[PDB]
């Protein structure tokens, strides 16, 4: 393991402007120095090489507008859905059933979720989505459960940010907070997603029903 | 917990013993011994193999019979998730050279997932963890694309008491054929035992010209 690929030593942070010691190389775009060590977060991050095989400045050079602190991450086209052979996004409008569990790295003003437990690398997220903004939600990780059916854009996640992607994303037409407001999602606390059976599916009916 | 606590005292009630080393002596219920090492143990960390059901309940719901002659019933539309009009969500997509895929199953089949996808994201029955070739414990195979080729690519519908919602790659030619024609190569476990080997070096960064 370790924070950087072995090639990056002895100066892995060369080219990075230090800003704040909470983050890798002092740069919030490179995510937090400290990573989760409890289930399920550690399970979702077990396959996560933060910069792939790149070093920090190469990673920022590739995926952001500038290695300097003013550089912003560039996001994939077509809302990050994987593209078919004709460059069109693969997705469909789909009804999320009551009982389905969803999770998300990001504030509740966002519109992108994944099925509960998807690996971080399946989400094609940059390292900064693991930064903590509310101490009640370390690593900006939120878990929800569908309390009333609603329709979302549903489809595969394109590779991005030096990761393979290919999770499924749910792109909502109301942001998360709005969906909670209107009774479509409820928040789950950690006791509701800390055992294996709580990842299983009781709501989908069988073929013989 | 192998069985949900609700199934005690006698979880194997209704199951006919057939073969030892399988849960309740029934190969449809998968092996007793589950994988002990990364990445397989990472892929099964969220797997409750019957959900909240007891073995006979699970077979009654998902197979044609609890008796040994029962066979698992599979989801329609080749297991793709369905949109609000009951059409499968998928597109034809080019898999790029370098992409890593994996699969629980034999090389005569056609369904793969992105390397590292959780077992519950694949909506597979317990018997896809059965070992048929000691060279491949749990029938777990990993591949890398060596020449680009087109697959059906889409979200995985929930089935078998699991949420699904990984992405599946549905090949037009079985795995063995694709290896033989030079589209896939087999990976040794040494080639997927480190986090960096799950990252993506082949997808290019956005154009900034
Ligand atoms: N296996 C995974 O890891 C996986 C990844 C992503 C998604 C999925 C999910 O798998 C589900 C399908 O399961 P199934 O066992 O049918 O897959 P697979 O093993 O690839 O087989 C495909 C078809 O090819 C035929 N055939 C396969 N072997 C032989 C053989 N030795 N001899 C003769 N014919 C054979 C047969 O029609 C079979 O149904 C589907 O619902 C899908 O959602 C799994
Ligand atoms: C690094 O900066 C943070 C402040 O960052 C802001 O607040 C975060 C919650 C998040 O919104 C970031 O994106 C923001 O840029 C410092 O956090 C403060 O730390 C002081 C410690 O003296 C503490 O008193 C305050 O409570 C913190 N402020 C907030 C708003 O939480 C942090 O200390 C900085 N790191 C270092 C090493 O100084
Ligand atoms: C599971 O076992 C069966 C054999 O039947 C079981 O074992 C007996 C010793 C006895 O205890 C029975 O009551 C059990 O039900 C295997 O089926 C045999 O397979 C071989 C090789 O393929 C074949 O030559 C025999 O004809 C088969 N016998 C029958 C009755 O079909 C079966 O292969 C085992 N399955 C697994 C996954 O191990
Ligand atoms: C598939 O098998 C079931 C169950 O078979 C019985 O139980 C097994 C464990 C073993 O002991 C078999 O030899 C048994 O016949 C069949 O279910 C029927 O179960 C009823 C229950 O009242 C019993 O009366 C019958 O005799 C069985 N039916 C027959 C013999 O026609 C089931 O029929 C089998 N599969 C199909 C497609 O019918
Ligand atoms: C995806 O493309 C297939 C056809 O792709 C060709 O055939 C495959 C077997 C494989 O060799 C590919 O590399 C080829 O490019 C479409 O299948 C056709 O669909 C139409 C209408 O749905 C049907 O009438 C044709 O007979 C199908 N062809 C075959 C050979 O079955 C498929 O529709 C495409 N899927 C999407 C979502 O665009
Ligand atoms: C972004 O900022 C660049 C200059 O940043 C400064 O120089 C670099 C080398 C670092 O030392 C950094 O800490 C400094 O703040 C500009 O050259 C560039 O044009 C700016 N980008 C935009 C889009 O304006
Ligand atoms: C999904 O629904 C939204 C809102 O109703 C609509 O704007 C969009 O075109 C639909 N997309 C598909 C693929 O049906
Ligand atoms: Ca719990
Ligand atoms: Ca290795
Ligand atoms: Na070096």
Author numbering:
A (entry chain A): 26 to 234
B (entry chain B): 27 to 235
Give passages from the manuscript.
Here, we report the identification of NADases on the surface of fungi such as the pathogen Aspergillus fumigatus and the saprophyte Neurospora crassa. The enzymes harbour a tuberculosis necrotizing toxin (TNT) domain and are predominately present in pathogenic species. Interestingly, N. crassa NADase (NcNADase) activity was not affected by either EGTA or Ca2+. Both AfNADase and NcNADase cleaved NAD+ and NADP+, but not their reduced counterparts, NADH and NADPH. The absence of ADP-ribosyl cyclase activity from the fungal NADase was further substantiated by its inability to convert the NAD+ analogue nicotinamide hypoxanthine dinucleotide (NHD+) to Nam and fluorescent N7-cyclic inosine diphosphoribose (N7-cIDPR), a reaction specifically observed for cyclases. These results demonstrate that fungal NADases are pure NAD glycohydrolases as they lack both cyclase and base-exchange activity.
To understand the catalytic mechanism of AfNADase and related NADases such as TNT, we attempted to solve the structure of the enzyme in complex with NAD+ by soaking the crystals with the dinucleotide. However, due to the fast conversion rate of NAD+ to Nam and ADPR, it was not possible to trap the substrate in the crystals. We therefore used the non-cleavable NAD+ analogue BAD, differing from NAD+ by the substitution of the nitrogen atom in the pyridine ring with a carbon atom. The structure of the complex clearly illustrates the binding mode of the substrate to the active site, and many of the residues are the same as those involved in product binding. The interaction with BAD includes two water molecules; one is found in the same position as water I in the structure of AfNADase bound to the products and the other, water II, makes contact with the proximal ribose. In the complex, F137 makes contact with the proximal ribose of BAD positioning the scissile bond into the active site. The benzamide (nicotinamide, by analogy) is also held in place by hydrogen bonding to R129, F130 and R148. The sidechain of Q194 makes contact with the 2” OH group of the proximal ribose. We propose a mechanism where water molecule I is hydrogen-bonded to the in-ring oxygen of the proximal ribose, the nicotinamide moiety, the phosphodiester backbone and R129. The nucleophilic attack is further prepared by Q129 which interacts with the 2” OH of the proximal ribose and can potentially induce a δ-negative charge. This mechanism would resemble a SN2 reaction with the formation of a transition state, in which the attack on the α-face on the C1’ position from water II coincides with the nicotinamide leaving and the formation of a partial oxocarbenium ion (oxonium intermediate).
